[PDB]
């Protein structure tokens, strides 16, 4: 069990850890989060009581070091930092648990939600999308733009997602114009799976990360990316059966975990009606389609 200690809680803030969140009052005595399941990536994120603009947060893997939060009254935000002195770290943490000033990662043991939402997400890959290599953890917020958004401004602060574009040369083989655009199997299997991602697991991992950035920070460009990685698959007539079946499980849990009230902005009607009712895979996503129709039938 791993711990993310907090130096203090100077400002009123809503703190989230994965899909869990609690209100912390200004100068409420709060010194971090314990019992965090080792073995998965996590995200710890923040929304100030005063400015619900800018949700922001930090992707991290407790296996890669000891991380702690400290508010910075100069930049005005809770900052993730690494402690390299392992004994300074255990000592701080132990003292805080003894005084019981830590909340407990509140994991139900029947619940595999977070596992299922992060199955394919790996910090090494996150670290290539969010470039800032002096740190082992990765900052994201509501306003960061993607590399593809900046095409059509500050790059140090971009999301370097994999560029997908259905009306482009990469996607369309000369002489197969009609075929490669109505059936994207070439683009998915050869260009992206064999070419860029190498395997379905890395693809699925970007997919998954995009959705979570969209859900936790309302990062508009991440949602676009999510929707795009889904569309490519649903618009392909030839997909390995092992990909279809996992994809159905991936989306099922994303739809499940979404706020009932945010489905108007974060879900793109066009993409989902294609996946579920028009595209080649209309018959191949039974779990995703059942929970969309019972939970969000308005959209369709």
């Amino acid at each position: 069990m791993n711990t993310v200690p907090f130096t203090s809680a100077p400002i009123e803030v809503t703190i989230g850890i994965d899909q869990y969140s609690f209100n912390v009052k200004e100068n409420q005595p709060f010194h971090g989060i314990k019992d965090i399941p080792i073995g998965h990536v996590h995200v710890i994120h923040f929304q100030h009581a005063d400015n619900s603009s800018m949700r922001y947060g930090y992707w991290f893997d407790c296996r890669m070091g000891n991380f702690y939060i400290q508010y910075d009254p100069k930049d005005g935000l809770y900052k993730m930092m690494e402690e390299r002195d392992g004994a300074k770290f255990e000592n701080i943490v132990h003292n805080f648990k003894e005084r019981q000033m830590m909340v407990s990662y509140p994991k139900i043991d029947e619940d595999d939600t977070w596992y299922n939402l992060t199955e394919f997400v790996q910090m090494d890959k996150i670290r290539k999308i969010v470039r800032k290599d002096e740190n082992q953890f990765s900052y994201v917020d509501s306003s960061m733009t993607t590399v593809q958004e900046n095409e059509l401004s500050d790059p140090a602060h971009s999301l370097n997602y994999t560029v997908i574009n259905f009306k482009s040369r990469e996607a369309i083989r000369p002489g197969h114009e009609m075929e490669d655009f109505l059936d994207k199997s070439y683009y998915l299997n050869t260009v992206m799976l064999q070419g860029i991602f190498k395997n379905s697991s890395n693809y699925f991992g970007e997919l998954q990360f995009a959705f979570l950035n969209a859900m936790f920070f309302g990062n508009y460009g991440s949602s676009l990316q999510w929707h795009a990685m889904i569309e490519l698959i649903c618009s392909s007539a030839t997909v390995p059966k092992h990909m279809l079946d996992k994809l159905d499980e991936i989306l099922y849990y994303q739809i499940k975990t979404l706020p009932e009230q945010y489905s108007d902005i974060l879900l793109n009607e066009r993409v989902w009606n294609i996946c579920l009712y028009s595209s080649f895979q209309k018959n191949s996503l039974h779990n995703t389609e059942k929970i969309m129709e019972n939970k969000y039938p308005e959209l369709l």
Binding site: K167, I172, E177, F181
Partner: protein, 237 residues
């Protein structure tokens, strides 16, 4: 953006641009089979690609052999239109390449856009005008070359004959569209009006009679009256 009443005059500026219409690409007659079912038989068609300033009409003839063994022909026809428009732009050098292609039906946008990844300086646009270019096959000269063709073939015409020796592009284009609008709404009347006076000859190399200015005014009025009337006959006013 889209092309409408407001940005009308742009079609006559220095930029050399084309209009693509695909409504006569895939043509079928529908008949009955011995068993009582219904089948289609394809006939020749054309792409209607036109420079609205000079009037040059690059009639591409679409031979029924291109459909053979193919499924979802209405959808293919638009991808075929896009391949043929693309090939035309690919035969012409950079300076000779047009600046804007305006498709008369929105379904052609993605087909062409895709078949023009190779030419990034040519903007593909739709339009909100209800242009009558589908009546192009009511022009005898053009109907005849399409129906007689035995192979894929491109034919060059100037749809304004020699009009640009006397009137402007704007004026040449308003006349053409009035003529085609007439033809579409009531072809028989439209045609009667054009051939009434036997002294006026439709010279073999022309679609349109060699009217004088004054005769064009009378013709143009008579087409207006026709277009107005068929609207009443249809809505009763």
């Amino acid at each position: 953006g889209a092309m409408n009443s407001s940005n009308y005059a742009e079609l006559f500026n220095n930029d050399i641009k084309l209009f693509v219409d695909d409504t006569n690409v895939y043509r079928v007659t529908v008949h009955k089979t011995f068993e009582g079912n219904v089948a289609t038989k394809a006939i020749n068609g054309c792409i209607f690609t036109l420079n609205p300033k000079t009037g040059h009409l690059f009639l591409k003839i679409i031979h029924t052999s291109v459909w053979a063994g193919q499924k979802r022909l209405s959808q293919l026809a638009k991808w075929k239109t896009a391949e043929e428009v693309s090939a035309l732009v690919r035969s012409l050098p950079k300076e000779e390449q047009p600046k804007q292609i305006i498709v008369t039906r929105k379904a052609m946008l993605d087909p062409l856009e895709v078949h023009m990844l190779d030419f990034p300086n040519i903007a593909i646009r739709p339009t909100e005008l209800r242009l009558p270019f589908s009546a192009a096959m009511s022009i005898d000269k053009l109907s005849d070359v399409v129906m007689k063709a035995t192979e894929p073939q491109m034919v060059l015409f100037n749809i304004y004959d020699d009009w640009l020796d006397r009137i402007s592009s704007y004026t040449a284009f308003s006349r053409l569209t009035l003529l085609l609008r007439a033809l579409k709404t009531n072809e028989e009347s439209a045609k009667m009006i054009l051939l009434s006076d036997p002294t006026i000859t439709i010279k073999s190399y022309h679609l349109w009679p060699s009217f004088t200015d004054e005769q064009w005014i009378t013709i143009e009025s008579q087409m207006r009256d026709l277009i107005l009337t068929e609207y009443g006959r249809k809505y009763n006013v």
